[PDB]
Amino acid sequence: GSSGSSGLEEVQLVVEPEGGAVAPGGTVTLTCEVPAQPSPQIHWMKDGVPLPLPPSPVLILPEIGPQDQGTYSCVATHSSHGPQESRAVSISIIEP
């Protein structure tokens, strides 16, 4: 958190659903395809730790559950750019 600072970010992480939640056993899609960059350096972190998976502009997490719950985030790193971490998406289970 923070007292109340306002900032911007080039990267626009897109999760599905947008809300960032799904039933216990669904499938989510983490799209971080930067508009300015065609094939930038896409990354995936879970709780401040690099997950064992190949870097791609599309990361689907089928069969989500309680263990899946957490907070993901895509980081873009390429020429004329720096370590920019997109908003953190907290994936949780919905109780319909």
UniProtKB/Swiss-Prot annotation:
Summed up, the tissue specificity of this protein is:
Endothelial cells. Increased expression in pre-term labor and preeclampsia placentas compared to controls.
PTM summary: Phosphorylated on its cytoplasmic domain by PKCzeta/PRKCZ upon ligand binding. Phosphorylated by ATM following DNA damage.
User: Start and end of every Ig-like C2-type domain?
Assistant: 8-90
Instruction: State the conditions that upregulate or repress this gene.
Output: Induced in T cells by antigen stimulation and by the S100B ligand. Induced in trophoblasts by DNA damage.
Report the function annotation for this chain. Cell surface pattern recognition receptor that senses endogenous stress signals with a broad ligand repertoire including advanced glycation end products, S100 proteins, high-mobility group box 1 protein/HMGB1, amyloid beta/APP oligomers, nucleic acids, histones, phospholipids and glycosaminoglycans. Advanced glycosylation end products are nonenzymatically glycosylated proteins which accumulate in vascular tissue in aging and at an accelerated rate in diabetes.
How is the quaternary structure described?
A: Constitutive homodimer; disulfide-linked. Forms homooligomers. Interacts with S100A1 and APP. Interacts with S100B, S100A12 and S100A14. Interacts with TIRAP. Interacts with HMGB1. Interacts with LGP2; this interaction plays an important role in AGER-mediated pro-inflammatory responses and cytokine release. Interacts with double-strand break repair protein MRE11 which is a core component of the MRN complex. The interaction enhances MRE11 endonuclease activity and promotes DNA repair.
Name the UniProt record assigns to this protein: Advanced glycosylation end product-specific receptor
Query: Which portion of the entire protein is included?
Result: 235 to 323 of 404
